[PDB]
From a paper:
Serine hydroxymethyltransferase (SHMT) reversibly interconverts serine and tetrahydrofolate (THF) into glycine and 5,10-methylene-THF (5,10-meTHF). Next, we have obtained high resolution crystal structures of AtSHMT2 complexed with MTX and PTX, as well as of AtSHMT4-MTX complex. For clarity, in this work we divide THF, MTX, and PTX molecules into three moieties: (i) pteridine or its mimic (P-moiety); (ii) benzoyl (B-moiety); and (iii) glutamate (E-moiety).
In AtSHMT4, all four subunits within the crystal structure are in the external aldimine PLP-Ser form. In AtSHMT4, (chain D) N1 of pteridine-2,4-diamine (with sp3 hybridization) interacts with Nζ of Lys373, whereas exocyclic N2 binds to carbonyl O of Arg67. The pteridine ring is stacked with the side chain of Tyr68*, equivalent to Tyr111* in AtSHMT2. The B-moiety is shielded by Ile147, Tyr139, and Ala382, corresponding to Ile189, Tyr182, and Ala423 of AtSHMT2, respectively. The E-moiety interacts with the backbone amide of Ala382 and Oγ of Ser142. Despite most of the interacting residues being conserved in AtSHMT2 and AtSHMT4, positioning of the P-moiety of MTX is different. Therefore, it is striking to see that the P-moiety in AtSHMT4 structure is posed in the same plane but rotated 180° with respect to the IA-type in AtSHMT2. Consistently, the stacking Tyr68* has a conformation similar to that of the corresponding Tyr111* of AtSHMT2 in the IA-type, and not to the EA-type as expected. Variability is present in the E-moiety binding region, however, the residue that ensures positive charge of the loop (Lys145 in AtSHMT4 and Lys187 in AtSHMT2) is universally conserved.
Author numbering:
A (entry chain B): 0 to 471
B (entry chain A): -2 to 470
C (entry chain D), D (entry chain C): 0 to 470
The structure:
C-alpha cells in the first residue's frame, strides 16, 4: 500500500526534513547578520525565489521554443519566449540584430557552450589573466604546465595582463600578444578588475588579428543593463553572463549573439550575414546540456522584469557610488587600493603595505561575520599567497545601504585589519601560530557582535526576518 | 530620483504581485501537470518539501570548492548541508563510505557525465555506449551517418556505440565484446534511456576487464529503482556511477557522481596495496575544471529527496512503478500491439509503431493534443530523428500521483483510442504529415478524447503543490 | 693550407675510406651468395645506381617544377618532369585525369603526406590489420593501447580483417565496421596478403560510408605496372607506392591523385573538379619534407623507363609463376601456406601447425644465408614471436631464376625448417635453449654451403661480379 | 623468356637512359659554371657519391644494429655502427653521455621524429621565427591562421624574433614569451642568422620554464664539428641536423640525444638518468619511417670520416674567413649587412637602403649565373617582399676559393646590384616593368660571361670537369 500523496508529497519541508530546514534557517540568519562583501554575491528577491521553487522543476522540455523534441510545452514555451525577449529588452538589443539562449545552467556552462559553438577543439583563446582580474573559465594553466580550466584542456589559451604600474589593461601588450598568438577568440570581461572596459579598442584588436570578440559581462551585467557601464553589445560578436551577481537574479547563464547582416568586411561577400544563432543553440543542446531547468528560466524572467525598471537603475548607480565611497574611505585611512579607485561594483585592496596576507584578513573577517575573499594584486602571478582582498557592493546595497553605511563598513574593515595586525604582532607571520589569536579573542568577539548588530538593523530581500526561526 | 526602491517593495513582495505574467503561466503549467496523463519516462512529480528547499535563500551563496576545502568563507552551514547530501546519497544507494564517495555538485545529468569523462579520460580517448536506436542516450556519444558530431561526448572524445541484438532486443554482449576488443575503449558505459530490461553489470565488468576499460554506469533513469533495491545494483561491479536525481529518484534537477575509493580488487600485474584514485580527479573535474559555484538550493533539495528515497514507503512506490509499467505493457500487448522485448523489467514501456504503419511523431503529436504526453523514440533500425518508429512510455510520474495497476490499464485504453484516432486520420487524409495535420483540426473524437483524459487525470492527488489553492480549477 | 680539392673531393672511395669500401664489398658478396627472399627487397639495375650516385645530390630544389623557391633549377625541373610523366605512363594514367608527386623520400613519408593532405588530425582511418597481412603505416595499436604507428598517434585507426576460414579479406565484416566506425579514409593494399584486391568492392564500401579510398600498392607496384595485378587506379582517389620493391627501382615514394572533372554525386556542384593536387603537393612540401632528394628522382626516372618495357612484363609474369611454384612445392611437403596459394609475388607460411614460431625459422635461415622475415598470421599478437614467415620472389627472379630454381629454394626452406624442428626437439622452445643448437651444427654448416653454392651460379644486376673484391 | 640480366641490369646509364644521362651532364655543367651562394648548398666528395650510388640501396634493415626485425644485416650493422660512432667522434661526444640515430631520411624527417619522440600531439613548441632567420620545421603559421608546417599542424608553435633594430636574437623577449606560453620544447638554431648562439642562455631559459632544449644545427653542422662555433652539446638535450650543408655529406639527418646520469636540478631525484634513447629510436622506427636508406648511411659514414680531419677544420676556418671577407667587402662599398658582420658561414645583406627588394636581386643574379636567395631582414614579416638576400660561403669554399676570390665575388655582386638599380631607374619598381630590362640587356650579358669564366677557373669535387660531357 503506497504512502498517500498528501503525506510525502504535500507536507511542508519543516515537517518532512527538520534537519535541512534547520540548516536553511541557520543560513538565513547568517545572511542577514553578516556584512556580505563577496563581489559575486547578491540577495535576490522573494518573487524570483517563488518562481525558482515551483512546479516548473518537473518538466522536461529539450529543444527550443517552437522546435521541441516532445510535447506538453505550451506554457514552458511562453515562459522561455518571455524570458528571452525580456533579456534582449533589459540589454537594449534590437531582436533583429541580437538573439539569446537562456538555457545555460550557470556561467561556466554558458562560457563552455559559447566556446564549443564558435571553435574547434584546440583552437586558440585569449582572456584576462587570473592575477590581473580574469576568471578561470577564460583559460588557466600553472607555471608547471598544469591545465586547471577545462577551457585550457580542450582549447589552447594564453592570458593577457594588466600593466603592473597602473593596474589598467595594457592594451598595447594585448595587441602585441594577439598578433603573435593569433587567437580565434578574444575574451574580454573579468572578475576582479576595478575599471570599465574599452570594447572599441578590443574590437580594433579583434579586427587586426582576425579573432571573434566575446564579452563575459557576468560581474557587471546589472550595471550594463542599467546603462551604468560601457555597452559590450556595441562591439562584441557574443556576450555571455551570469544572472545571479549584479543582475540580482537566480543562478543561471545566458548567451547573447549577433544576427543579421555583417558590417563591411575586408574582401568578403556583400550580403553576408551572421551565423552564430544555430551554432550557439546546438552547442547548448543537444551537444552539451540536457533538459533545461525551467524553474531557473521562469525565475530569470522575473529577475529580468525587475532589472528593467527605473528602480534598478537607481540601485546600479547606488552600487557604484557605494563602491566608490568604500574605496575613498579606505584610502583616507592610508590603505592602498588598486588603481586608486573604482569605476564599478568592486574594490581591490592591496594588503602588502600592511605586512598582511589576504588569507589572514579573509580568515579574521569571516570569524567576525564579514565575508570577502582574498585576491591577487597588481598582476602578481606567483603562488598561493594572495596579497589582497576583493570587496564588492552589490549584496549590501541590495539591503538598502548607501554611502554612509558603506563608510561604516570601511570602519569595520579598519578595525578588522587593525585586529589582524595585532594578532600577527603577538604570534607572528606563520598561519598555524596566527590561528592561536583567533580563538577566545574578546576583541574579535566584540567586533563580531558589533558587525552583527549593524547587519541585523537592515531589511533583507527574499524572506521575512520577522518569520525566521533564529532571530537572536 | 537617486533613492532606491524599498526592500519590502521589490524584495519581499510575492511573485503574484511582482510578475503577474509569470505567475499566471506557472499556474497554467500547474493545472496542465495535474490534468494530463504524463507518460514521459524521464519525468516525475517531486515533493513540496523538495520544492521548498529549492526555492530558498541557499541560492544566494557562493561556495566554490568542497566541504572542508572552500575558496571563500561563510560556508559553515553550506558545508553541513552538502555533507548531509553526500552521506544521504551513499546511504540511499547502500555504499560503504570507506569504499565509495560522491560529488553532488553537477548541475544536471549531462554535466555529471561530461565531468566524469573529463576526470577519467584525456581528450580524444575512446568511449563506447549504448546506441540511441538501441535505447542509449546522447551523452554517451552520438554521431550521424554523415559524420556529424552531435553529442559533445563525440566532439571531445572518440565514441563508438554498441547495440541490442537484432532479434531479441537485448544487449548483444558478444558483439559488444567483439567491438571493444577491436576498438579498445578507455571507458565502457552502461545504462540507457529507453532500454526496457535490466542490465548485467557482471558481464559488463568481465568485458571491461577483458579489454582494459573503466566501467561506468549512468543509472539516471532507474536511480529510484536501484535505491529501492528494485533493480540490479551497478555499484557492485562499476568503477563510477553517474545519475540524475529528478527522474525515478523523484528529486530536484541535479547530477551526482559516485566513485570507488580505497583498495583495488586483485588484478594480475597490479602492484600490491593499490588504491583507487578516482576521488581527486572527479572532484577536480567538477571544480575547478568545468563548473563554477555549486547550486546550493539544488543540493539542499537533493538532500531532502535522498532522505525521502531511503524509506520503506519509497520502496513500495518503486515496486508499484514497475508493476504499473508491466500492467500497461500487458494491456497494450493484449490489444495486439508490439512492445519491445515483449515486456519490461523497469519503469518504462517501449512501443513499436512500425507494424501499424505509423510514425512515432504522429502519435506523439496527437497525444499532446489530447493531454497525453509521451515522446517518440527510436526503435531498432531507425535512421530518422524527426520521425522515428516508436514511442516510449514511463510509469513514475502518474504512479507518484497514486495510480495503481487498474488506473494504468485505463491509461492503456486511452493510448489505444489515441492510436486508433491516429490511424483514422491517416486513413482519411494520407500518410504524409502535411496531409495528416488536417485531421488534427476541428476533430470531434479528438475533442472527446481530450475531455475524457482530463476528467480522468483530475481524479487523483498531486504532489508538490495544493490543487485546492491553484489559480485554475 | 687547405687540403686540395682533388685530394678530398675527387679521390675514389677505395682510397678515401677503405673501411667503408670493404664493408660494401662484403655486402655485395652477401647479396649474390645468399637466397634473398625478403618480399620487399629487389636488386635494382646499374643504370638506376649510376643516377642515384650523382651530382644531383648537390641541388636544393624546394617547390615543384616551374614553381621553385630558389633559382638554378632548369635541369632539376626537366628531370622531375620526366620522372612524373614516366610515372603516369608506367601505370597507364591519362595525365588529364591523374597527377603524381615523386618527391616522398620513401613509402612511409608518402603515406603520411597523403594522410596530412587529406585529413585533419584525429580523423578516422581504416586499414588492413597486421595479422591479416597489413602494414604498420596503415595504423597499428596494441591490445594494451600502445600507439605504435605514427598513423595511430596522429589519427584514429581501426583495422579490418581477413575472414578466418578463407584467408581472404572479409568484405562483409569490413562494410559492417566502416558503417559503425565511419572512417574518413579507407586504405587498401598490404604487405603479406597473398591475393589480389577487389578495388570495385572497396569503392562500393567507401561510397556507402562517405570515405576517401586510398590504395597503397607498394608491394605489387611492379605487377600493377605490368598489368599482372588488378588496377587500383580504376577505383581509388589516391594511390601511394614505394619504388624499390617489385617496381625494381630506387628507394623512394610516390603519391598519385585524380585530377579533372568529378563523377556525379550529390551536393556537388555540376562541373566540380577534384582538389587533390594542391593539397598533396602542399603536404609534401612545405608541410612535411624539405628539399627533394634529386638523385633519387633521377634514378627513379630511369627505373620508370625500365619498368615500361615488354621485358619488365615478362619479369612480372615470371615473379608470379615463381611464387606459385614455390608455394606449390611447400604445400606438397605438407606445409600450410595461407589461402593455400598465391596470386602475387609472395607466399605467406603458417608455422604454428609445425609447433614453430617465425623468429626461430628466420634466425636459422639467416645463419644459412637464407634471408626472409618472420610475419604475423591470423590471430597473432606477438612482436617477437609471430606464427609465420613471409617469402617473396622479386629479388631472386631478378637474378634470372625460374620455376625449377624456386622448387630448389623450397627444398632448402624445407631443409631449414626440419633443422629448426630438430634443434627445438633436442633443446626446447626457450630462446636460450633453442640457441644451443645454432652453434657447432654440422647440418647447419652443410646447408649454408649448399645454399651459397646454389646462389653464386646466377647473374647479378647492379654491379659486376667479375670486378668485386670478394669472390 | 626473360630478358638477360646483363642487358637491363648491368648496362650503364648512358646507353640505358640517354635522356636522364644527358640532363645530369647538363646539371654537372651548371654546377661549375656559376657562383653558388645558397647557404644551404655544398659540393660533396666523389667518395661520398660512390657510397651513395651502391648496392646498399637493395637492403631492407628495419630496426637498429643488433636489434633488427630480420636477417641479412651482418654488414649493414657494421656500417651503421661505424656511422654512429664516427658521428659521435666528429662532434666530440662521450658515447656514455650521448647517442645518435642516423636513420632520418633528411632534416625535416629528423626534426619531426624528434618532436614525435619528445612530445604528445598539440604540445607547445617555440622556435626562431622564419622572418627572423628560423626554419619552417620549427613552426610556421600565417597571419591568416593557415598552418604551414606540419610542426604547426600537429603541435602548437609560437615563434621568437630577432631585435628589429640590431638583428640579434632578443633573448629577453624570448624569456618573456616562454614564461607566458610555457613550451614543452624550446628549439634553437636557424637558417638565415649570421651570429653564433648563446646556448647557456637558452638553457637558463629552458630550465626557468621547464622546457626541453633542442638545437637544430643543420646549417652550422660543419662549423660545430670543426670546433669553429659554439657547441650546442654542452647545453641541449637533443641536437638534430642535416648532413648535406656545411658538413658536406649526403642528404640525410641525424638525431643526437643525451644518455646516462642527469646533472643536478632542483626537484630531480638523485641518480635520475636520461630517457631519450628509446623514445627517439621508436619515433624514427617503427613510428614514422620504414626501411633505412643504407646507401645514405654508408655515404654518411664517409662524410663523417672526412669531417673529422685536420683538413676539414682548415676548411671550416676558411668558410668563416670567406664569409667575413665578403661581408667586410660589401660594407667597404657602402652596402649594409645585418648585425654588421658575421660569425658563421653566411651574410645577410640589407637591400632596403638601396631601394631594392630581394626578389629583384635574386632574379637578376640567376640570369647571370649567381645563385642566392631573397630573405627577410631584421625579422620583418609585414614587408610585401623580402628586403634582403642570403649568401653562403660553404659551396664555393669547397671549390678552393680563399678570401681574395670572395672579394672578387663581392665585386660581381656589386655589379649585379648596380645593374639591378640601372634597370629600376629606367623601368621603375613594378616587376611587370622591371621584367622588361631582363631581356636583350648587353650589360647583363657581360656579367653572365665574366661570372662563367670566373667559375670555370676552379676545380670541382664530386666529379671530373675534364671528363664531363659539356665543356
Ligand atoms: C540530437 N539528435 C537526436 C534527436 C532526437 N529527437 C529529436 N527531435 C526533434 N524534433 N528534432 C531533433 N533534431 C531531434 N534529434 C539528432 C540530431 C540530428 C540527427 C540527424 O542528423 N539525422 C539525419 C540522419 C543522419 C545523416 O544523414 O547524417 C536525418 O535524416 O534525420 C539525428 C539525431
Ligand atoms: C611493431 N610491432 C610489430 C613488430 C614486428 N617485428 C618486430 N621485430 C622485432 N625484433 N621487434 C619488434 N618490436 C617487432 N615488432 C609491434 C610492436 C610492439 C608490440 C608490443 O608492444 N607488445 C606485445 C604484445 C602484448 C600486447 O597485446 O600489447 C609483444 O610482446 O609482442 C607488438 C608488435
Ligand atoms: C541515461 C541518461 N543520462 C543522462 C541524462 C541527462 O539528464 P539531464 O537532462 O539532466 O542533463 C539523461 C536524460 N534523459 C532524458 C532527456 O534526454 C530522457 O527523456 O530520457 C539520460 O536518460
Ligand atoms: C566573469 C565570470 N564568468 C563566469 C563565472 C562563473 O559563474 P558560475 O559560478 O555560475 O559558473 C564567474 C564567477 N565568478 C565567481 C566565482 O569565481 C566570483 O566570485 O568571482 C565569473 O566571475
Ligand atoms: C635549420 C634547418 N633544419 C632543417 C632543414 C631541412 O633539411 P632537409 O631539406 O633535408 O629536410 C633546413 C633546410 N634549409 C634549407 C631549405 O629550407 C635552406 O636553404 O636553409 C634547415 O635550414
Ligand atoms: C604496403 C607498404 N607501404 C609502405 C611501406 C613503407 O615503405 P618504406 O620502407 O620506404 O617506408 C611498406 C614497407 N614494407 C616493407 C618494410 O616494412 C616490408 O618488408 O613489407 C609497405 O609494405
Amino acid at each position: 500500500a503506497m504512502e498517500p500523496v498528501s503525506s510525502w508529497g504535500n507536507t511542508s519541508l519543516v515537517s518532512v526534513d527538520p534537519e535541512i530546514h534547520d540548516l536553511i534557517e541557520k543560513e538565513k540568519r547568517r545572511q542577514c547578520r553578516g556584512i556580505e562583501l563577496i563581489a559575486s554575491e547578491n540577495f535576490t528577491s522573494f518573487a524570483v525565489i517563488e518562481a525558482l521553487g515551483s512546479a516548473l522543476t518537473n518538466k522536461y522540455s529539450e529543444g527550443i521554443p517552437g522546435n521541441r523534441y516532445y510535447g506538453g510545452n505550451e506554457f514552458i514555451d511562453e515562459i522561455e519566449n518571455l524570458c528571452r525577449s525580456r533579456a534582449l529588452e533589459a540589454f537594449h538589443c534590437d531582436p533583429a540584430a541580437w538573439g539569446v539562449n537562456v538555457q545555460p545552467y550557470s556561467g561556466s556552462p554558458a562560457n563552455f557552450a559559447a566556446y564549443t559553438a564558435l571553435l574547434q577543439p584546440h583552437d586558440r583563446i585569449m582572456g584576462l589573466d587570473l592575477p590581473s582580474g580574469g576568471h578561470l573559465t577564460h583559460g588557466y594553466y600553472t607555471s608547471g604546465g598544469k591545465k586547471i580550466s577545462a577551457t585550457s584542456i580542450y582549447f589552447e589559451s594564453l592570458p593577457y595582463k594588466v600593466n603592473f604600474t597602473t593596474g589598467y589593461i595594457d592594451y598595447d601588450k594585448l595587441e602585441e600578444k594577439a598578433l603573435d598568438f593569433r587567437p580565434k577568440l578574444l575574451i574580454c570581461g573579468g572578475s576582479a578588475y576595478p575599471r570599465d572596459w574599452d570594447y572599441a579598442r578590443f574590437r580594433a584588436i579583434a579586427d587586426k588579428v582576425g579573432a571573434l570578440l566575446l564579452c563575459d559581462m557576468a560581474h557587471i551585467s546589472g550595471l550594463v543593463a542599467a546603462q551604468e557601464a560601457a555597452n559590450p553589445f556595441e562591439y562584441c560578436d557574443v556576450v555571455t553572463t551570469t544572472t545571479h551577481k549584479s543582475l540580482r537574479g537566480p543562478r543561471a547563464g545566458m548567451i547573447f549573439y549577433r544576427k543579421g547582416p555583417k558590417p563591411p568586411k575586408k574582401g568578403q561577400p556583400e550580403g553576408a550575414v551572421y551565423d552564430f544563432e544555430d551554432k550557439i543553440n546546438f552547442a547548448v543542446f543537444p551537444a552539451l546540456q540536457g533538459g533545461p531547468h525551467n524553474h531557473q528560466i521562469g525565475a530569470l524572467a522575473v529577475a529580468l522584469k525587475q532589472a528593467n525598471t527605473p528602480g534598478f537603475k537607481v540601485y546600479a548607480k547606488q552600487v557604484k557610488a557605494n563602491a566608490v565611497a568604500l574605496g575613498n574611505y579606505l584610502m583616507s585611512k592610508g590603505y592602498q587600493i588598486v588603481t586608486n579607485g573604482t569605476e564599478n561594483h568592486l574594490v581591490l585592496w592591496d594588503l602588502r603595505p600592511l605586512g598582511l596576507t589576504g588569507n589572514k584578513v579573509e580568515k579574521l573577517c569571516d570569524l567576525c561575520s564579514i565575508t570577502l575573499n582574498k585576491n591577487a594584486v597588481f598582476g602578481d602571478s606567483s603562488a598561493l599567497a594572495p596579497g589582497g582582498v576583493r570587496i564588492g557592493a552589490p549584496a549590501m546595497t541590495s539591503r538598502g545601504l548607501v554611502e554612509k553605511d558603506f563608510e561604516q563598513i570601511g570602519e569595520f574593515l579598519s578595525r578588522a585589519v587593525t585586529l589582524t595586525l595585532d594578532i600577527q604582532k603577538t604570534y607572528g607571520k606563520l598561519l598555524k601560530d596566527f590561528n592561536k589569536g583567533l580563538v577566545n579573542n574578546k576583541d574579535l568577539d566584540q567586533l563580531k557582535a558589533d558587525v552583527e548588530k549593524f547587519s541585523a538593523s537592515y531589511e533583507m530581500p527574499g524572506f521575512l526576518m520577522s518569520e525566521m526561526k533564529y532571530k537572536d
